[PDB]
Design an enzyme around this catalytic site. Structure first.
Site, short mmCIF file in Angstrom:
data_model
loop_
_atom_site.label_atom_id
_atom_site.label_comp_id
_atom_site.label_asym_id
_atom_site.label_seq_id
_atom_site.Cartn_x
_atom_site.Cartn_y
_atom_site.Cartn_z
N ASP A 1 5.31 12.60 15.71
CA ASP A 1 5.18 12.75 14.26
C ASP A 1 3.76 13.05 13.84
OD1 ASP A 1 6.26 13.17 11.71
OD2 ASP A 1 6.38 11.04 11.21
N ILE B 1 0.86 -1.18 0.00
CA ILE B 1 0.00 0.00 0.00
C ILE B 1 0.91 1.23 0.00
CG2 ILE B 1 -1.76 1.28 1.40
CD1 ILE B 1 -2.78 -1.53 -0.19
N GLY B 2 1.80 1.30 0.98
CA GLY B 2 2.74 2.40 1.13
C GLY B 2 3.84 2.06 2.09
N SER B 3 4.16 2.99 2.99
CA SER B 3 5.20 2.79 3.97
C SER B 3 4.93 3.56 5.25
CB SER B 3 6.57 3.19 3.41
OG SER B 3 7.64 2.66 4.18
N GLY B 4 5.36 2.96 6.35
CA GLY B 4 5.27 3.56 7.68
C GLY B 4 6.66 3.86 8.16
N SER B 5 6.80 4.25 9.42
CA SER B 5 8.14 4.46 9.94
C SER B 5 8.65 3.05 10.28
CB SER B 5 8.14 5.38 11.15
OG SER B 5 7.59 4.74 12.28
N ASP C 1 7.17 -1.39 5.52
CA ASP C 1 6.20 -1.29 4.43
C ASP C 1 4.84 -1.87 4.84
OD1 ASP C 1 8.13 -0.20 2.65
OD2 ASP C 1 8.16 -1.94 1.30
N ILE C 2 3.78 -1.28 4.31
CA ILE C 2 2.39 -1.68 4.56
C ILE C 2 1.89 -2.43 3.31
CG2 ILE C 2 0.07 -0.81 5.23
CD1 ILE C 2 2.67 -0.01 7.21
#
Ligand SMILES: CNCc1cc(-c2cn(C)nc2-c2ccc(F)cc2)ccn1
Length: 265
Positions: free
Chosen positions: A126, A13-17, A20-21
């Site tokens: 954040d 899907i994307g990325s977190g800290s 990856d998601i």
């Protein structure tokens, strides 16, 4: 791909800290999920620390449910309920313009999310639009807060507090000051220190709050002035800040009906 006997792994899907998601399916329950992956062998493992933070936060309004945690092949795996788009995604979908009613509906919930995290002895560190996600279906009116990768028991340059740019240890006031820049960002479509090509710290410090908030209700300036006046160890008056926006909401004659700009599309 099979994950923890009941989950089927889908696409990124994307990325977190720190990870990856991916999309997923809980095969046993018949529900779509969101899956965060972390390499087992990374120098600084954090997935399991973050899962403990989510676990401690469970029960709080707008805290996503963590369904499973474990290790599969080369990865550490965390499974979360599927949530909707982030406020950054929704802002972009709305042509980078939110009505005052939408900004105030979001501010009310977002102050409460931050207060809850603080009541659990953590600071987020954040606070930004991509870390707030709307729920899905019956939870579609709910703002969720995500990503405890940078959280600490008591970030992004665009939303960092002046104290952060000065190199001071972040505290409760800093999460709230960041929200204040997030709210002004939603009002303006951009911040004055955005897209400069260090320079952000200088621009923030040379921009008076009255100039940043010019043409917008005084409450946004009062909010930022209050956050900047807070002492390092001060417990913020969250009720006062929610009341500032609530009084303005009532003066404008808006109805607390959870109908945001995107619901009108
Ligand atoms: C955006 N809707 C899909 C979506 C994304 C997410 C998501 C986003 N980011 C940056 N991180 C997470 C995340 C997903 C799983 C997890 F265990 C920990 C965090 C969450 C739910 N639903």
């Amino acid at each position: 791909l099979r994950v923890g006997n009941r989950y089927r792994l889908g696409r990124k899907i994307g990325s977190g800290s720190f990870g990856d998601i991916y999309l997923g399916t809980d095969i046993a329950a018949g529900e779509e999920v969101a899956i965060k992956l972390e390499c087992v062998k990374t120098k600084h493992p954090q997935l399991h620390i973050e899962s403990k933070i989510y676990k401690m936060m469970q029960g709080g309004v707008g805290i996503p449910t963590i369904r499973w945690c474990g290790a599969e092949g080369d990865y550490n795996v965390m499974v979360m309920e599927l949530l909707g788009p982030s406020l950054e995604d929704l802002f972009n979908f709305c042509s980078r313009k939110f009505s005052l009613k939408t900004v105030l509906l979001l501010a009310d919930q977002m102050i409460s999310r931050i207060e809850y995290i603080h009541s659990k002895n953590f600071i987020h560190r954040d606070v930004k639009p991509d870390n707030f996600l709307m729920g899905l279906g019956k939870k579609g009116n709910l703002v969720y807060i995500i990503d405890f990768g940078l959280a600490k028991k008591y970030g992004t340059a665009r939303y960092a507090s002046i104290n952060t740019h000065l190199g001071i240890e972040q505290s409760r006031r800093d999460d709230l000051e960041s929200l204040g820049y997030v709210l002004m960002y939603f009002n303006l479509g951009s911040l004055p220190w955005q897209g400069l090509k260090e320079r952000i710290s200088e621009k923030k410090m040379s921009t008076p709050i009255e100039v940043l908030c010019k043409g917008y209700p005084s409450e946004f300036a009062t909010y930022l002035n209050f956050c900047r006046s807070l002492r390092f160890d001060d417990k913020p008056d969250y009720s006062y800040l929610r009341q500032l926006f609530r009084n303005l909401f009532h003066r404008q004659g808006f109805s607390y009906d959870y109908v945001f700009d995107w619901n009108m599309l």
